[PDB]
Design a protein around this ligand. Structure first.
Ligand SMILES: CC#CCN(C)C1CCS(=O)(=O)CC1
Ligand SMILES: CC#CCN(C)C1CCS(=O)(=O)CC1
Length: 185
């Protein structure tokens, strides 16, 4: 792909984080802590899952960023509406305002409803995410495999401002403690 020139500097919004997450001082990395991180509750925090939003809001244009997923067993990545549900249980779908892919139990899937099997020959260590607001497109690229396409959501109905979306995943296994990291431009 040739989307690198639309690179944007993403930072994480502490106020949206699940209360177990630890966001680095530079707001570029997030991981699951082993307990509640001693923050007050607020209506923005994702309550049921280890999720956090980027601070940036996008309502036009073309945007590109990259996320490091090295040695993780489970994660979700993409974009979502600013108005997505924060509390209780919900599925990651375009109907609920999410355009995402994930790794779960040794398979990669796109967050359609129902979910779509992805075909990845080279497990990615970094993911590129491209949003074209006007065109209604969200695309995912395998940076480890020379930028190969993973998945394109087209005919997207964003229906609001978009935020970068992250899920570090649970760590029931003891094998998923590693952080998500926003990679430098
Ligand atoms: C099937 C599947 C999948 C991957 N995610 C959509 C979930 C999000 C909720 S969760 O509790 O973080 C488990 C992982
Ligand atoms: C956020 C949240 C939650 C659910 N928890 C009580 C734990 C979090 C740490 S764990 O290792 O994922 C086991 C499940």
């Amino acid at each position: 792909h040739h989307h690198h020139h639309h690179m944007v500097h993403i930072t994480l919004d502490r106020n949206t984080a699940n209360s177990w997450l630890i966001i680095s001082k530079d707001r570029r990395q997030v991981r699951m802590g082993d307990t509640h991180q001693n923050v007050s509750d607020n209506k923005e925090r994702f309550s049921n899952y280890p999720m956090v939003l980027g601070a940036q809001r996008f309502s036009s244009g073309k945007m590109y960023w990259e996320v490091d997923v090295t040695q993780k067993e489970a994660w979700d990545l993409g974009v979502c509406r600013d108005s997505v549900q924060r509390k209780g249980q919900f599925s990651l779908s375009p109907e609920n305002g999410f355009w995402t892919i994930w790794l779960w139990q040794d398979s990669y899937e796109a967050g359609t409803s129902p979910q779509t099997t992805l075909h990845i020959q080279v497990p990615p260590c970094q993911i590129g995410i491209f949003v074209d607001y006007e065109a209604g497109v969200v695309s995912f690229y395998n940076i480890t495999d020379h930028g190969s396409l993973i998945y394109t959501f087209s005919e997207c109905v964003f229906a609001g401002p978009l935020r970068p979306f992250f899920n570090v995943g649970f760590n029931y296994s003891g094998g998923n403690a590693a952080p998500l990291k926003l990679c430098p431009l």
